Amino acid sequence: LDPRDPLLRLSNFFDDGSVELLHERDRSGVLAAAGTVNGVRTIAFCTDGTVMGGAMGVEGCTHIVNAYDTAIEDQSPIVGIWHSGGARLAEGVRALHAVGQVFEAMIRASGYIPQISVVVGFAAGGAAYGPALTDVVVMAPESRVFVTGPASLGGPETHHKKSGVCHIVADDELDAYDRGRRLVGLFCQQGHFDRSKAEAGDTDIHALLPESSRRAYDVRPIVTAILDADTPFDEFQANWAPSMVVGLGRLSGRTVGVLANNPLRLGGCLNSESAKAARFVRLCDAFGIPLVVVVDVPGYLPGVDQEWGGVVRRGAKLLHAFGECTVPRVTLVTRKTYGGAYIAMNSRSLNATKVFAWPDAEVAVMGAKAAVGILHKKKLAAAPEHEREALHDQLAAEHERIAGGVDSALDIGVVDEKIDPAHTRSKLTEALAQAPARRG
């Protein structure tokens, strides 16, 4: 049907007048074309919902693989638009194989050219799976995903927003293209840092914290404050693993990625799904996008039935991701950062470019009460049971008053600089701009 026409959809994604088909238009079920997105040379393809419901066949898959080869050869970002019931069943194994070849193209392009998927209609089988292999998936609210064993039929607002496969949910198809468009800008027009612009955007970000250090808040406004005032923050997977906020924005015009623990959920603790962070770190590392890491993390948690496997493994990926990272990655410790979670959240030991702290920030092996329970075991043990807890609290209060602390952390060298939170934005920019583009 006319609204599902591939050339139409492609023409809606591309800059007006920039479309050049990569092959003769047929009934293969895909149409690939070159064009520009705000002037950036971009390859794109669109499944043809007007033909067998966009079902993927041999000839169609060959157009996609060809488009990928073209994008890789030119080092151009590649955007797929999806509306497809999966493989053409009647073609059998030939289509099966052809689909796998699409996957292999996507794997070859991985970390080399940006791959953006825009899901605008129905998607099942290999057409649901394809997007899963790309870097950022944008879903139109009308889009539907279906997957079954040897079963789920949902839209993004009903399922996929909360499952970490969908990165961004749009307002409508047109808006989905707009976001897709803005995504290639973020990857392919990364811009440059500007001290002046950074300084002029400075606010007392610290005022966004609640009065009690012991209580939760939403970190998102802090992210907002750091990033350029009237440029959107493109948060990924906002409703999946919400103890961890990640996404792309601009910092004095320069594309940067942000990771921030969100105390709003699970007290900001890391867990299996949030350790989301690993994949995002690899994304920015792949494409030369520097990182701002906002740390407020009291530890890590197990899953459903207190199972530890997920967080131990996903955590390992996080450690690797940061440890291997070579783009600049600056850490800001806002309130608390303890133990293994501290090590994992862009610590110095993992080659963090620079670590900043707010004056009241705390860096420690563990919580005061736990530490004190261990350090003063003799006095605690020897106490009468009815005073033991009061003693413990007294010990803990004094320990948090005189231990932890930025001054001690500066002395060791795990924190590089304590900063006035009113210059948070400008200090971050400086540290990132002064950093080498690679190594660290």
Ligand X SMILES: C[C@@H](Oc1ccc(Oc2ncc(C(F)(F)F)cc2Cl)cc1)C(=O)O
Interface of this chain with a second copy, residues 236 to 255, rule: CB under 8 A: 240
DSSP secondary structure letters along 27-92: SSSEEEEEEEETTEEEEEEEE-TTTGGG-B-HHHHHHHHHHHHHHHHHT--EEEEEEE-SB-GGGT
CB atoms within 10 A of CB 55: 24
Q: Are 173 and 121 in contact (CB under 8 A)?
A: no
Question: Residue 96, exposed/middle/buried by CB under 10 A (0-12, 13-18, 19+)?
Answer: middle
Is 53 noted as a catalytic residue in this protein?
A: no
CA angle centred on 161, ends 11 and 310, rounded to 5°: 130
Of 299, 292, 349, 300, nearest in space to 323 by CA: 349
CA separation for the pair 77, 225 (Å, rounded)? 30
Secondary element (H or E) of residue 364: strand 362-364
Crossing angle of helices 6-13/173-188, nearest 10°?
Answer: 50
Give phi and psi for 215, each to the nearest 5. Answer: -115, 155
Residue from 339, 340, 373, 440 carrying the catalytic annotation: 340
Q: Among 277, 293, 371, 395, which residue sits at the site for a second copy (rule: CB under 8 A)?
A: 371
33 binds ligand X (CB under 6 A): no
Is 341 noted as a catalytic residue in this protein?
A: yes
Is 125 noted as a catalytic residue in this protein?
A: yes
Q: Among 5, 103, 233, 360, which residue sits at the site for a second copy (rule: CB under 8 A)?
A: 103
Only segment of 205-213, 216-224, 286-294, 359-367 that touches a second copy (CB under 8 A): 359-367
> Which x/- pattern over 256-275 shows residues binding a second copy (rule: CB under 8 A)?
-----------x-x------
Nearer to ligand X, 76 or 261 (CB): 261
Q: Among 12, 36, 70, 101, which residue sits at the site for a second copy (rule: CB under 8 A)?
A: 101
Q: Which two tokens stand for residue 24?
A: 């003769």
49 binds ligand X (CB under 6 A): no
Nearer to a second copy, 136 or 227 (CB): 136
172 binds, among a second copy, ligand X, none (CB under 5 to 8 A by kind): none
Of 287, 276, 355, 278, nearest in space to 323 by CA: 278
CA separation for the pair 215, 264 (Å, rounded)? 9
Q: Which two tokens stand for residue 84?
A: 């497809």
For the bound state, the minimum distance from the C-beta of residue 198 to a second copy, rounded and expressed in Å, comes to 30
Distances (CA, A) of 438 to 109, 286, 325, 328: 21, 11, 9, 7
For the bound state, the minimum distance from the C-beta of residue 219 to a second copy, rounded and expressed in Å, comes to 17
> Which x/- pattern over 329-348 shows residues binding ligand X (rule: CB under 6 A)?
----------xxx-xx----
267 binds, among ligand X, a second copy, none (CB under 5 to 8 A by kind): a second copy
123 binds, among ligand X, a second copy, none (CB under 5 to 8 A by kind): ligand X
275 binds, among ligand X, a second copy, none (CB under 5 to 8 A by kind): ligand X
Is 149 noted as a catalytic residue in this protein?
A: no
Only segment of 13-21, 35-43, 228-236, 402-410 that touches a second copy (CB under 8 A): 402-410
Secondary element (H or E) of residue 425: helix 424-434
412 binds a second copy (CB under 8 A): yes
Nearer to ligand X, 160 or 282 (CB): 160
409 binds a second copy (CB under 8 A): yes
408 binds a second copy (CB under 8 A): yes
User: Which residues 174-233 are close enough to bind ligand X by CB under 6 A?
Assistant: none
119 binds, among ligand X, a second copy, none (CB under 5 to 8 A by kind): ligand X
Of 113, 39, 50, nearest in space to 80 by CA: 113
Instruction: Say which DSSP state 428 is in.
Output: H
> Which x/- pattern over 83-122 shows residues binding ligand X (rule: CB under 6 A)?
---xx--------x--x-------------------x---
160 binds ligand X (CB under 6 A): yes
CA angle centred on 344, ends 342 and 349, rounded to 5°: 80
Give phi and psi for 62, each to the nearest 5. Answer: -60, -40
Contact positions toward ligand X, by CB under 6 A?
86-87, 96, 99, 119, 123, 125-126, 128-129, 131-132, 137, 139, 145, 147, 152, 154, 159-160, 162-163, 165-166, 270, 275, 300, 306-309, 311-312, 315, 318, 339-341, 343-344, 365
Residues that are catalytic: 125-126, 340-341
